[PDB]
């Protein structure tokens, strides 16, 4: 009869015919990931082509129902999600060119092998050949060689490809009634039609700048301390007034600073909180790790894992004969099938990763009652944030003592809390200016503020201004230095890590206030608290049915992303860094004073 009832029946038909097909596609992807064989690759490609063609035909059917004659918010949300053209609005030649460009960037990044000129008989791939060198070497010219040679090969291959990529994506986005591709990425946080809880695409950049202006003193103090420690490690290269050299940050790109914890430790003489040896002594299998994680999630009141999870997941490396992707991934295959694909070792990092991916699984299980096209996070930040809060809670010494993995006579003094908070800052605080600078640069590239001949001159200027990192030698426009990273070369949004980092501490403050913890925020554990789990599950069960602003009101009581929980989490460390930076100079100079 009416348009709304027609759309409701069409959405029922869509969810019905897209659930089995999504399960087949996800099962083919799973069979590829646990078994790298050519027929599984062919089955994955066939299932993906069927899934994309079916989504094209259902979007084509969906556009014939106009949006303004539907008043129910969930139905309007599913119709808004379905009626996006994607690449279909673009011409078939340009769509094929864009798909070819994306695939060849994937092959160039995945099969990129770089080694030293005049020694070409064997070469090292990025993982793990270059990762181990970047994370563990202490030699200046070796790291400089690896960094410059990998950005030479990868950038000189990817620069015309990226120049075509920006034009094609901008053409598709302006064909989709967006300002640029950056506006298309910012449309994930767009809330329209809800009274008071509306969020705009243009408000996101202003909110990011407003939060980063409060990030900036803590990052300046951390940068000054890391600069002083790297000056101690490398005596003559680092200047007291200038930026940090790019190849010394402990990772390939500067994404995380967590590989500088050995060089920048405050109190090396004091012990660590490493629980690896205790699990080796008690012979903790990966099955025991996941069962302890399940015990943690049942202690907070969340549902326990399904029988199909324990039957169908691969929690151990299969062997030499069978090949599998080593990256830990939680899979919501559909129809109530939840699995974790992780090559779990007996380490603290794998244990925290197991908690993180089981948090992903809990988030996926919570919105199983929702309709199929609403089975996602409310934004891209929440999905990672609910795993990162489990990574926060599981890493605490109280959790390790509670499960017996730490000695009950371990002394928790202020020095161990300072160095733990510094490690968490190197992991968490250090990625924030890099993430903000990369996303702001990509937004200005898509918007056309930066011409193609001036991409890199601005970019290093941004890195000196924001990240406080100087290039070793100047780069011309033959280089493509951003696209050496996985997410940007393979068309992924990058602001999810910034939003994840802020939502992580907002959720942490909300659950610790729910759990009635009376001490420091970093000393807080959310186990044994039924009300914290209930407050979490109220937001978790919604999925994408409600706006992320309303979900954030449901958890923390605020209508917008906030920076104060992060500053409260690191406040002992902030005071300690302010005490330690009396003699040294906080802040950096954007000039070429150290080296160029």
């Amino acid at each position: 009869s009416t348009i709304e009832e027609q759309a409701k029946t069409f959405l029922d038909k869509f969810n019905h015919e897209a659930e089995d097909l999504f399960y087949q596609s996800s099962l083919a992807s799973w069979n590829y990931n646990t078994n790298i064989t050519e027929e599984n690759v062919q089955n994955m490609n066939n299932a993906g082509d069927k899934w994309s063609a079916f989504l094209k035909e259902q979007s084509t059917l969906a556009q014939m129902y106009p949006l303004q004659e539907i008043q129910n918010l969930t139905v309007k949300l599913q119709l808004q999600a379905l009626q996006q053209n994607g690449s279909s609005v673009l011409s078939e030649d340009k769509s094929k060119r864009l798909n070819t460009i994306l695939n060849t960037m994937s092959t160039i990044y995945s099969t990129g092998k770089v080694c030293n000129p005049d020694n070409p008989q064997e070469c090292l791939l990025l993982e793990p050949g270059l990762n181990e060198i970047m994370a563990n070497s202490l030699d200046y010219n070796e790291r400089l060689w690896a960094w410059e040679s990998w950005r030479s090969e990868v950038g000189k291959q990817l620069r015309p490809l990226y120049e075509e990529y920006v034009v094609l994506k901008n053409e598709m986005a302006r064909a989709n009634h967006y300002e640029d591709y950056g506006d298309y990425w910012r449309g994930d946080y767009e809330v329209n039609g809800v009274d008071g809880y509306d969020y705009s695409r243009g408000q996101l950049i202003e909110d990011v700048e407003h939060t980063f202006e409060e990030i900036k003193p803590l990052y300046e103090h951390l940068h000054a301390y890391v600069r002083a420690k790297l000056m101690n490690a490398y005596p003559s290269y680092i200047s007291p007034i200038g930026c940090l050299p790019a190849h010394l940050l402990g990772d390939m790109w500067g994404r995380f600073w967590t590989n500088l914890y050995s060089l920048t430790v405050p109190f090396g003489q004091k012990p660590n909180i490493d629980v690896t040896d205790a699990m080796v002594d008690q012979a903790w299998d990966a099955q025991r790790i996941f069962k302890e994680a399940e015990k943690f999630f049942v202690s907070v009141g969340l549902p326990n894992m399904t029988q199909g999870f324990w039957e169908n997941s691969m929690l151990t490396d299969p062997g030499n004969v069978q090949k599998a992707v080593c990256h830990p991934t939680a899979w919501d295959l559909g129809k109530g099938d939840f699995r974790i694909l992780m090559c779990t070792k007996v380490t603290m990092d794998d244990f925290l990763t197991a908690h993180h991916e089981m948090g992903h699984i809990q988030y996926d299980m919570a919105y199983a009652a929702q309709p199929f096209l609403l089975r996602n996070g409310a934004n891209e930040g929440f999905h990672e944030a609910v795993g990162e809060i489990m990574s926060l809670s599981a890493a605490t010494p109280k959790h390790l003592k509670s499960i017996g993995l730490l000695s009950p006579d371990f002394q928790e003094d202020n020095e161990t809390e300072i160095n733990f908070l510094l490690k968490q800052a190197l992991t968490i605080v250090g990625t924030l200016p890099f993430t903000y600078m990369l996303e702001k640069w990509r937004w200005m590239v898509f918007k056309g503020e930066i011409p193609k001949d001036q991409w890199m001159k601005k970019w290093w200027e941004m890195k000196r201004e924001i990240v406080g990192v100087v290039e070793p030698v100047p780069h011309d426009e033959t280089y493509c230095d951003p696209a050496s990273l996985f997410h940007v070369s393979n068309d992924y949004s990058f602001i999810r890590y910034y939003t994840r980092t802020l939502y992580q501490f907002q959720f942490q403050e909300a659950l610790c206030q729910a759990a009635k913890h009376e001490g420091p925020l970093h000393k807080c554990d959310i186990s044994n608290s039924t009300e914290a789990g209930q407050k979490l599950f109220n937001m978790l069960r919604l999925g994408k049915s409600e706006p992320w602003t309303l979900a954030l009101e449901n958890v923390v009581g605020a209508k917008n992303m906030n920076v104060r929980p992060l500053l409260n989490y690191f406040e002992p460390l902030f005071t300690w860094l302010k005490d330690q930076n009396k003699n040294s100079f906080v802040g950096w100079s954007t000039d070429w004073s150290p080296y160029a």
Binding site: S1, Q6, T9, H16, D20, L333
Partner: protein, 99 residues
């Protein structure tokens, strides 16, 4: 995948109690006539179930048998088993033989 189990997804009105609908006529959700072909706003009402052994317990197939007991004015003949106490002879007992 076992797709040998179909359900009715759309009907104009709700079913009466103990009604069976095996009609395979195209459901008309819109003003346009379907004309017997599944096009736009016109859907085939019978849809297949996807049953895989790796599905969750909320998606696994469940066999349901519903037993309906009615009493009508005719003599009731589907009776339960009448438990019989062993026979004891030569004593003053309370006997109940066939009512």
């Amino acid at each position: 995948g076992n797709y040998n189990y179909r359900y009715r997804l759309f009907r104009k009105s709700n079913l009466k109690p103990f009604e069976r609908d095996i009609s395979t006529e195209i459901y008309q959700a819109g003003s346009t006539p379907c004309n017997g072909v599944e096009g736009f706003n016109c859907y085939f009402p019978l849809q297949s179930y996807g049953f895989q052994p790796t599905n969750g317990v909320g998606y696994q197939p469940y066999r349901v048998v519903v037993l309906s007991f009615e009493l009508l004015h005719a003599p009731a003949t589907v009776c339960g088993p009448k438990k019989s106490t062993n026979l004891v002879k030569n004593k003053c007992v309370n006997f109940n033989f066939n009512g």
